[PDB]
Design a protein around this ligand. Structure first.
Ligand SMILES: CCCCCCCCCCCCCCCCCC(=O)OC[C@H](CO[C@@H]1O[C@H](CO[C@H]2O[C@H](CO)[C@H](O)[C@H](O)[C@H]2O)[C@H](O)[C@H](O)[C@H]1O)OC(=O)CCCCCCCCCCCCCCCCC
Ligand SMILES: CCCCCCCCCCCCCCCCCC(=O)OC[C@H](CO[C@@H]1O[C@H](CO[C@H]2O[C@H](CO)[C@H](O)[C@H](O)[C@H]2O)[C@H](O)[C@H](O)[C@H]1O)OC(=O)CCCCCCCCCCCCCCCCC
Ligand code: CLA
Ligand code: CLA
Ligand code: CLA
Ligand code: CLA
Ligand code: CLA
Ligand SMILES: CC1=C(/C=C/C(C)=C/C=C/C(C)=C/C=C/C=C(C)/C=C/C=C(C)/C=C/C2=C(C)CCCC2(C)C)C(C)(C)CCC1
Ligand SMILES: CC1=C(/C=C/C(C)=C/C=C/C(C)=C/C=C/C=C(C)/C=C/C=C(C)/C=C/C2=C(C)CCCC2(C)C)C(C)(C)CCC1
Ligand SMILES: CC1=C(/C=C/C(C)=C/C=C/C(C)=C/C=C/C=C(C)/C=C/C=C(C)/C=C/C2=C(C)CCCC2(C)C)C(C)(C)CCC1
Ligand SMILES: CCCCCCCCCCCCO[C@@H]1O[C@H](CO)[C@@H](O[C@H]2O[C@H](CO)[C@@H](O)[C@H](O)[C@H]2O)[C@H](O)[C@H]1O
Ligand code: OEX
Ligand SMILES: [Ca+2]
Ligand SMILES: [Cl-]
Ligand SMILES: [Cl-]
Ligand SMILES: [Fe+2]
Lengths: 35, 78, 34, 334, 135, 341, 450
């Protein structure tokens, strides 16, 4: 009950997840590059 | 048994989390997409595009040989 | 560079959208941690 | 009361110092046969024409080998998959020249280890145990059968079996990489994850238990004397171990259940070795690892190499040099 | 660099006349090469007889020389020996014998032109084209 | 209450992810390492150091991407971003392979931070620090392989590259150039790793098959409580089973678990000693007696001599593309090859 | 029936064990699963038809189902050339539609039908411990298996024939007229050694022996079906076996593991039931094809192919098998037991004949040998053909390789499943599958070993 939103665990989760999704979108764009 | 943070299953089943992450995760995805598809990643990391592995004046591997002056070496390599 | 703005503006949109959807409770938590 | 029932009671007896059982009636003769012939051949067997090209390879200690280089050399390529027992040779010297001891040792050994697996079930049944230790032992058995039986069957020659020696094993591995790219085979990758992870989990489990032992000794004597064989109580604090490991990573990455943890310990290297045994068993039929040679081309069509291409150059070197007088034709098809 | 016009510019006959394939014709010839030729002519070798490879020196040394598009198109209609003496129409895949070579029976004249063009362009993209079997 | 004790209170708070004092070393450095790997394999080429594509941006897959080692012309230069090679240019730093010493040094310090975390949590929980002592094996392997081996060689170029097929290349390289299979230090490592996998499998299966019936379900996993005092499986039955099957058995659970620690850690340490030997080309390459006999008698052949021929062929065929900075021009006629291949 | 752990004692990850004593839901599981098998048969056939280029050889095209139909004699002519695409399409459509029927029936029995069939009918309701009913079900299913083998016989003898690769004039669909009813040949195949030159039942080299075996199998399975309907298990069988549902499952698992291994070896070695016109060459076939191709090529250049020694002193092209037969040289000496319709015309009583090699080699034998040596079952996991050191331009892995690898792996994992279910059946019947009872632990009453 009345948990904090932003924690050390929040920063931990986003430090990895946010560039993870950035990189996954980048590699998905890479799949359509032609020779 | 719980360190005090909100449990993950209570978070990812909440309406507010999905209102926010229904925009934030597609925006990060298409930001990475635009990093690649605009060609910005090539100039940022120095990675050759498929037409710049070899030039008209160089048909060999551009293996670095200078100890220090590698900026001039790579420019020459083009 | 138009490429840098084109890439960075989804990040600004994501930060903005999360800020409108969380900012009242984030202000509340910041007041709770003084 | 009958003689046969008395023999059945002795064979299946839990009071025997080494359990025999009905699987043991097959395992003991076969393993003793293969052990005797292996020791004699490793010490004293004459050179074996393994490749069938009249170029005999010396494998035994008395013919100039050491412990590292010594081997019981596989049977001749001229034999192939043909059954070559002692009585089908015109003399013992011909049987020795053609690699008959390899067929004798391998066939008895393989029967012996399958009966060892069955004997593990059998003793678990006679002791009132759960029966699945033999399922775990099926993974080294599958790997041994893959390299001694299944790969020769797929390649059409026992000459392609793993030699019974240390440097012969290395020769087998290197030629296998040259011909199959086993490193780039996802099932060997699971094998490696199996053995690397199995050693990791062996060290973590052993370290966590030793870290959390209940104080029962002094620091003069060894801590192992704090355990009595047959004691009812647990000798370490699983809650302390869990409270350590769930702070080392996070709480729900840590086993609080000892049965769940021990299952995971059993299952991970067994599954990994099952996968790599199937990798070798499928590369027997030349379903090889990943080929990414010239996968990347520039816009003109010039090859841009990767690490797979450099690995392929290494594979070429091995291949064009192996069994260097055996090939008469442009392709190594088997 | 790009797949330039000069890279796709190859001799057409023995009189110095040249031709320039398009990118579409190059890709169609490469596809026909992968689908039909590579089982024996992977990387320009010849797995069944590597004395007669698809390398440029070997194509130049044929009688008459096969380093132009018209001679290659004539070879794929009537294959001969390397000295042009023995009839090889029952021993080499060709468009003139569909009854024994059904895989080539749907390839048009422009398909043969494209695969001949790709056979002429591919050695200048690869230094190992037409070498030994293990190389 | 002084500021140090207040900071120690905050760093050692019970939270989903424990930080501690060691986290100040562990969490940035590891994030520098792993992200530095993930950046490189996604974006960064090895075209100017190796003549190779090694990123997803160039079309390589997960098996073929790497953060490849730097160019051999730099020697053992640490290749700082501000250093005399890149001179603060980020793009040039990426192109010359500066991401390799970035990931290797941040990884080294991150591994140090992780061992310090093991010590810190072991002290705060109240247990003995044998998890950290066990983790010395992986640190010995990392330090010997990724640091000491290229430091003994000409440059950072001959260090393993942080990729799947790059590691495979390093593996085959040490075969053909060092005969690393013939090295007893490696053979002890193989014994330790396969023995640790054996011990993991056999101990897990033995426990799961000598379980006490402490519940009614066929699901035996819920018949265990973490606060229970009794053993969940029969040590006596397990000992009798393995004594009759195998000849010997564990009778002491503490020795069992210490052995489960001891075998793969000793294997890692012994293989590290061998890698330190290979750093100076101090190889177990040859048996000189068998070489002299084979040189004087052309009928003598063993598997060892066959492996020597295999290494010779791999060296000659691999060196021009693997060491492109050396400009090895080996014509086709000098390459060793058998008949018809 | 319980659908949770508290009421069954089985977790979710072992849920289908909640059906052991629920015969109606068990039947629905069994019948829905059959749906799935017939669904894959039909949908995979339609996929293979849709991707088929019929002038191109089936084995170039990743097909494992159209070769099975073509071997039965449908849609093919001489040399396995595709006459019509419609029989393959028909086989696909009929399986796909029927699979819909089987899936609807499994869902019924599984979700709506009675959970136990024993209170509804004595004929269909079974107890696992009822040895008469278990053997009755064996018997019904044996009569059906014998009818299936006789249906293969009827297709070969009465309804158009099967593809014979060994047929004179070239391989063709032919009607089998004189099947081998001689039990000496049929069961001497069972008596032959599982080694080189003998090959057990993998060495069946003619369609007459295959069709005669299926007449005998049909007769044997029908007779064994009636036996098991009319009889009950005897005392030695009752005292030797475990009588439980898991036990019967494990017996079937060991049986399936054995047939998976046999199928992998069959498709790897046998070119009669698996004709090389559809499946491509075997590995032995391709190696002998390479040796023959270069024998022909060097003979055309004027080499004396019989008097040519190689570097080792053995004959470069021709040499002697260990029993003396004149065979091809190099490493293919291993494959001198290989027999094929392109090669057997050049064989004499002593082996390969010099006169036939000099003046009887036809151009089609050269074409077939070149095609088979370049379609050797060597390939990468991403389907790059040839040796693994080759570059990426040949998209080919042999159907023999795919089928053999698959069935070997399946066979191994079904042996593992046999060990798991047999061991568990033994422990559950003996009463200690859930663990050692602490009070009556058997080791605590045994004497010490030393
Ligand atoms: C333990 C566990 C705890 C974990 C710790 C993790 C922490 C990691 C952080 C440590 C990183 C240290 C990097 C050291 C870089 C280096 O070494 O860089 C090397 C330099 C020397 O540079 C080299 O020097 C060589 C010799 O040069 C000399 O000779 C040349 C030819 O004759 C020329 O004449 C040249 O001018 C002349 O200087 C070549 O030039 C090489 O190209 C050049 O790179 O030494 C130096 O900086 C310093 C030399 C002295 C310090 C050595 C300490 C490191 C130990 C190394 C062991 C070496 C070999 C044994 C291997 C086994
Ligand atoms: C309980 C059982 C206990 C029984 C134990 C008895 C031993 C069984 C294993 C046999 C050992 C095989 C060794 C050599 C195999 C071989 O030469 O080859 C295999 C033989 C096939 O023989 C081949 O059969 C061929 C027949 O083809 C011939 O005829 C054909 C007709 O079309 C073609 O014309 C062809 O060209 C022509 O050559 C040839 O004769 C070959 O020379 C001949 O070698 O398979 C066979 O006979 C039968 C299949 C063999 C076993 C199947 C695999 C079993 C693997 C289990 C692994 C388990 C792992 C679990 C671990 C835990
Ligand atoms: C071949 C696959 C297969 C089959 C046929 C079955 C069949 C069955 N399972 Mg098992 N199961 C399987 C795989 C399978 N399972 C796997 C892989 C797992 C692990 C996740 C389980 C785990 C499991 C548990 C834990 C339990 C079962 C149970 C059951 C039985 C009752 C199912 C029930 O109540 O569902 C109710 C489910 C639904 C009503 C959801 C809808 C399901 C339908 C069938 C969807 C069909 C879709 C299909 C496209 C429609 C086609 C219609 C027509 C055109 C043909 C049933 C006989 C239960 C049991 O033992 O009963 C006592 C049970 O407790 N299963
Ligand atoms: C006996 C089974 C079998 C066999 C031999 C084949 C063989 C083939 N299929 Mg088919 N297929 C099958 C089942 C089978 N398939 C099934 C069940 C499906 C439905 C999912 C399909 C769907 C299918 C399609 C849609 C296509 C093929 C194609 C192909 C061809 C290329 C295969 C390829 O590239 O694989 C790549 C290799 C892999 C993906 C490796 C998979 C490894 C598995 C997962 C390992 C499993 C191990 C073990 C069982 C797991 C147990 C774990 C536990 C016990 C511990 C080849 C002829 C292609 C083709 O050319 O057709 C014209 C094609 O397009 N198949
Ligand atoms: C192995 C398969 C199998 C088995 C053993 C059963 C058994 C049973 N079913 Mg089920 N059923 C099945 C498949 C099966 N069914 C399929 C596939 C469907 C979907 C069409 C159904 C749909 C179904 C319904 C809707 C009902 C049953 C019912 C019953 C029960 C009464 C049977 C009866 O009246 O028989 C006597 C009937 C006959 C003797 C006439 C039928 C003869 C068959 C159908 C003709 C030939 C079979 C087939 C076409 C041959 C080729 C098959 C091919 C796969 C080789 C009995 C327990 C009833 C039930 O639950 O009772 C409470 C019920 O209401 N079944
Ligand atoms: C798949 C179908 C099937 C199934 C499940 C069964 C199941 C059974 N049969 Mg039946 N049987 C079948 C088909 C089948 N049979 C057919 C088709 C026939 C007609 C030929 C018979 C004729 C038959 C008779 C005459 C008898 C049985 C009996 C039995 C029972 C005991 C069998 C036993 O202990 O074997 C275990 C086998 C042995 C103990 C023999 C040991 C010999 C060694 C182990 C053979 C090893 C061979 C090796 C593993 C593989 C080599 C392959 C090949 C070269 C041989 C059991 C219920 C018995 C019974 O109780 O009657 C009611 C009985 O007397 N069956
Ligand atoms: C026809 C054969 C058959 C049948 C009917 C059964 C039936 C049963 N098994 Mg057995 N089993 C079999 C074969 C069979 N098994 C084989 C071959 C093995 C060896 C691998 C096992 C090993 C085995 C174990 C270890 C156990 C059982 C158990 C059980 C029971 C519960 C099963 C369940 O709910 O699964 C639930 C299903 C799942 C959880 C999903 C399985 C996931 C697998 C790994 C997927 C494999 C991948 C596949 C190839 C496709 C790849 C997809 C990929 C692309 C993602 C049930 C009585 C349990 C038992 O003892 O109960 C008494 C049990 O613990 N089975
Ligand atoms: C380099 C560098 C740096 C650093 C950076 C960083 C630190 C970062 C990062 C980063 C990151 C951090 C990134 C990321 C990522 C990611 C990714 C790329 C992912 C992925 C994934 C996937 C794809 C997965 C998948 C899967 C699988 C396979 C299994 C199961 C399922 C799933 C889906 C899960 C700096 C600037 C400082 C400086 C300069 C240099
Ligand atoms: C019980 C259960 C289960 C299972 C289920 C199953 C197993 C099923 C099934 C089912 C099935 C088995 C099905 C089916 C189907 C089919 C269909 C639905 C069909 C069809 C058809 C059609 C429609 C066709 C069409 C066509 C034609 C006619 C020709 C041309 C082409 C085409 C394709 C168009 C599970 C696991 C979930 C779990 C829970 C319980
Ligand atoms: C169709 C065909 C044919 C024919 C075939 C035949 C005629 C057959 C057969 C078959 C048979 C006739 C079989 C069988 C089998 C048997 C088995 C597989 C067995 C067994 C065993 C068991 C299982 C036992 C067990 C045991 C013991 C060991 C003792 C104690 C008790 C018990 C029960 C545990 C031919 C090749 C001509 C050609 C191709 C096609
Ligand atoms: C999440 C992924 C993380 C990886 C890194 C991503 C960042 C993107 C790369 C941007 C590269 C910018 O490209 C390069 O930047 C460097 C900054 O170091 C500039 O460098 C310039 O300023 C620096 C700063 O004093 C000078 O030391 C240097 O000599 C000069 O060239 C280069 O002129 C520019 O070409
Ligand atoms: O013997 Mn033993 O290694 Ca199977 O691959 Mn062909 O064989 Mn020989 O070569 Mn490469
Ligand atoms: Ca073709
Ligand atoms: Cl060799
Ligand atoms: Cl050869
Ligand atoms: Fe333990």
């Amino acid at each position: 009950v009345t948990y904090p939103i932003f924690t050390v665990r929040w920063l931990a989760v986003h430090t990895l997840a946010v560039p993870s999704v950035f990189f996954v979108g980048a590699i998905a764009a890479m799949q359509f590059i032609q020779r | 048994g719980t360190t005090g943070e909100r449990p993950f299953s209570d978070i990812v089943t909440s309406i507010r989390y999905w209102v926010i992450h229904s925009i934030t995760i597609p925006m990060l995805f298409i930001a990475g997409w635009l990093f690649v598809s605009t060609g910005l990643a090539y100039d940022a990391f120095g990675t050759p595009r498929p037409d710049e592995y070899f030039t008209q004046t160089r048909q060999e591997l551009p293996i670095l040989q200078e100890r220090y002056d590698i900026n001039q070496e790579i420019q020459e390599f083009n | 560079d138009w490429r840098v703005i084109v890439v960075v503006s989804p990040l600004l949109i994501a930060a903005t959208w999360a800020a409108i959807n969380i900012g009242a409770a984030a202000i509340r938590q910041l007041q709770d941690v003084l | 009361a009958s003689l046969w029932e008395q023999f059945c009671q002795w064979v299946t007896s839990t009071n025997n110092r080494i359990y025999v059982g009905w699987f043991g009636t097959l395992m003991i003769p076969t393993l003793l046969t293969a052990t005797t012939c292996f020791i004699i051949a490793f010490i004293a067997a004459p050179p074996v024409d393994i490749d069938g090209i009249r170029e005999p390879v010396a494998g035994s200690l008395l013919y100039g080998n050491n412990i590292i280089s010594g081997a019981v050399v596989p049977s001749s390529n001229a034999i192939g998959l043909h059954f070559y027992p002692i009585w089908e040779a015109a003399s013992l010297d011909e049987w020795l020249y053609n690699g008959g001891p390899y067929q004798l040792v391998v066939f008895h050994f393989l029967i012996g280890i399958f009966c060892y697996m069955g004997r593990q079930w059998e003793l678990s049944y006679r002791l009132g145990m759960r029966p699945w230790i033999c399922v775990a032992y099926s993974a080294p058995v599958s790997a041994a059968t893959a390299v001694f039986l299944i790969y020769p069957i797929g390649q059409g020659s026992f000459s392609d079996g793993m030699p019974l020696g240390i440097s012969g094993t290395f020769n087998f591995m290197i030629v296998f990489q040259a011909e199959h790219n086993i490193l780039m085979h996802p099932f060997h990758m699971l094998g490696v994850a199996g053995v690397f992870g199995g050693s990791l989990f062996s060290a973590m489990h052993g370290s966590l238990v030793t870290s959390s032992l209940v104080r029962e000794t002094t620091e003069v004597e060894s801590q192992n004397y704090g355990y009595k064989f047959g004691q009812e109580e647990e000798t370490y604090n699983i809650v302390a171990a869990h409270g350590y490991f769930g702070r080392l990573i996070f709480q729900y990455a840590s086993f609080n259940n000892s049965r769940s943890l021990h299952f995971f310990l059993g299952a991970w290297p067994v599954i990994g070795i099952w996968f790599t045994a199937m990798g070798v068993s499928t590369m027997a039929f030349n379903l090889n690892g990943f080929n990414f040679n010239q996968s990347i081309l520039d816009s003109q069509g010039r090859v841009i190499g990767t690490w797979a291409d450099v690995l392929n150059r290494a594979n070429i070197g091995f291949e064009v040099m192996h069994e260097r007088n055996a090939h008469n034709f442009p392709l190594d098809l088997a | 660099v790009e797949l330039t016009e000069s890279t796709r510019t190859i001799p057409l006959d023995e009189a110095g006349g040249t031709t320039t394939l398009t990118a579409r014709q190059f890709t169609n010839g490469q596809k026909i090469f992968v689908d039909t030729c590579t089982q024996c002519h992977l990387q320009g070798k010849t797995k069944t007889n590597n004395n007669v490879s698809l390398g440029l020196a070997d194509l130049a040394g044929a009688e008459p020389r096969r380093d132009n598009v018209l001679a290659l198109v004539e070879f794929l209609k009537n294959p001969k020996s390397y000295d042009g003496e023995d009839d090889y129409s029952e021993l080499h895949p060709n468009i003139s014998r569909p009854d024994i070579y059904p895989e080539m029976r749907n390839y048009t004249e422009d398909d043969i032109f494209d695969v001949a063009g790709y056979t002429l362009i591919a050695p200048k993209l690869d230094e190992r084209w037409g070498g030994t079997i293990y190389f | 209450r002084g500021w140090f004790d207040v900071l120690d209170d905050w760093l050692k708070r019970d939270r989903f992810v424990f930080i501690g004092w060691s986290g100040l070393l562990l969490f940035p450095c590891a994030f520098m390492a792993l992200g530095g790997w993930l950046t490189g394999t996604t974006f960064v080429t090895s075209w100017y150091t190796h003549g190779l594509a090694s990123s997803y941006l160039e079309g390589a897959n997960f098996l073929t991407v790497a953060v490849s080692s730097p160019a051999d012309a730099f020697g053992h230069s640490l290749l700082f971003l501000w250093g005399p090679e890149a001179q603060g240019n980020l793009t040039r730093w990426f192109q010359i392979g500066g991401l390799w010493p970035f990931v290797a040094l941040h990884g080294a310090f991150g591994l140090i931070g992780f061992m310090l975390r093991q010590f810190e949590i072991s002290r705060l929980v109240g247990i003995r620090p044998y998890n950290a002592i066990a983790f010395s094996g992986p640190i010995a392997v990392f330090v010997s392989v990724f640091l000491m081996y290229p430091l003994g060689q000409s440059s950072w170029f001959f260090a393993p590259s942080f990729g799947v097929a790059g590691i495979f290349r390093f593996i085959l390289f040490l075969q053909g150039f060092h005969n690393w299979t013939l090295n007893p230090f490696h053979m002890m490592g193989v014994a330790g790793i396969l023995g640790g996998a054996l011990l993991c499998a056999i101990h897990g299966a033995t426990v799961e098959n000598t379980l006490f019936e402490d519940g009614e379900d066929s699901n035996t996993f819920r018949a265990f409580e973490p606060t229970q005092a009794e053993e969940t499986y029969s040590m006596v039955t397990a000992n009798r089973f393995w004594s009759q099957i195998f000849g010997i058995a564990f009778s002491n659970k503490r020795w069992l678990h210490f052995f489960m620690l001891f075998v793969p850690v000793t294997g890692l340490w012994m293989s590290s000693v061998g890698i330190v030997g290979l750093a100076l080309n101090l190889r177990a390459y040859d048996f000189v007696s068998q070489e002299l006999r084979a040189a004087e008698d052309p009928e003598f052949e063993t598997f060892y001599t066959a492996n020597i021929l295999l290494n010779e062929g791999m060296r000659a065929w691999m060196a021009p593309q693997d060491q492109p900075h050396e400009n090895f021009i080996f014509p086709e006629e000098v390459l060793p090859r058998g008949n018809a291949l | 029936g319980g659908r949770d752990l508290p009421s069954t004692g089985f977790a979710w990850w072992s849920g289908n064990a909640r059906l052991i004593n629920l015969s109606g839901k068990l039947l629905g599981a069994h019948v829905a699963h059959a749906g799935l098998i017939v669904f894959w048969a039909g949908a995979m056939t339609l996929f293979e038809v849709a991707h088929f280029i019929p002038e191109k050889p089936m084995y170039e095209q990743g097909l494992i189902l159209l070769p099975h139909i073509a071997t039965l004699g449908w849609g093919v002519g001489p040399a396995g050339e595709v006459t019509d695409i419609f029989p393959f399409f028909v086989v696909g459509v009929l399986h796909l539609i029927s699979s819909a029927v089987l899936g609807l029936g499994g869902i019924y029995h599984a979700l709506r039908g009675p959970e136990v069939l024993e209170e509804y009918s004595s004929f269909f309701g079974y107890d696992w411990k009822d040895k008469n009913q278990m053997t009755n079900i064996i018997g019904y299913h044996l009569i059906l298996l014998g009818c299936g083998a006789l249906l293969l016989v009827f297709k070969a003898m009465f309804f158009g024939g099967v593809y014979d690769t060994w047929a004179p004039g070239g391989g063709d669909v032919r009607v089998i007229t004189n099947p081998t009813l001689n039990p000496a040949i049929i069961f001497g195949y069972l008596l032959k050694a599982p080694f080189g030159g003998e090959g057990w039942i993998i060495s069946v080299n003619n369609m007459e022996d295959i069709i005669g075996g299926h007449i005998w199998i049909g007769l044997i399975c029908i007779s064994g079906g009636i036996w098991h309907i009319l009889t009950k298990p005897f005392g030695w069988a009752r005292r030797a076996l475990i009588w439980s549902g898991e036990a019967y499952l494990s017996y079937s698992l060991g049986a399936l593991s054995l047939m998976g291994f046999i199928a992998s070896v069959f498709v790897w070695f046998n070119n009669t039931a698996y004709p090389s016109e559809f499946y491509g060459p075997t590995g032995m076939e391709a190696s002998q094809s390479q040796a023959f191709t270069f024998l022909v090529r060097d003979q055309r250049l004027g080499a004396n192919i019989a008097s040519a020694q190689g570097p080792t002193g053995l004959g470069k092209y021709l040499m002697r098998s260990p029993s003396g037969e004149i065979i091809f040289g190099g490493e293919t000496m291993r494959f001198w037991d290989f027999r094929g319709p392109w090669l057997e015309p050049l064989r004499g009583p002593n082996g390969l004949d010099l006169d036939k090699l000099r003046n009887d080699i036809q151009p089609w034998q050269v074409r077939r040998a070149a095609e088979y040596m370049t379609h050797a079952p060597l390939g990468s996991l991403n389907s790059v053909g040839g040796v693994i050191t080759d570059v990426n331009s040949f998209n080919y892995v042999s159907p023999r390789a795919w089928l053999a690898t698959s069935h070997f792996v399946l066979g191994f994992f079904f042996l593992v499943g046999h060990l798991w279910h047999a061991g568990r059946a033994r422990a559950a019947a003996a009463g200690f599958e859930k663990g050692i009872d602490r009070e009556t632990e058997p080791t605590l009453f045994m004497p010490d070993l030393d």
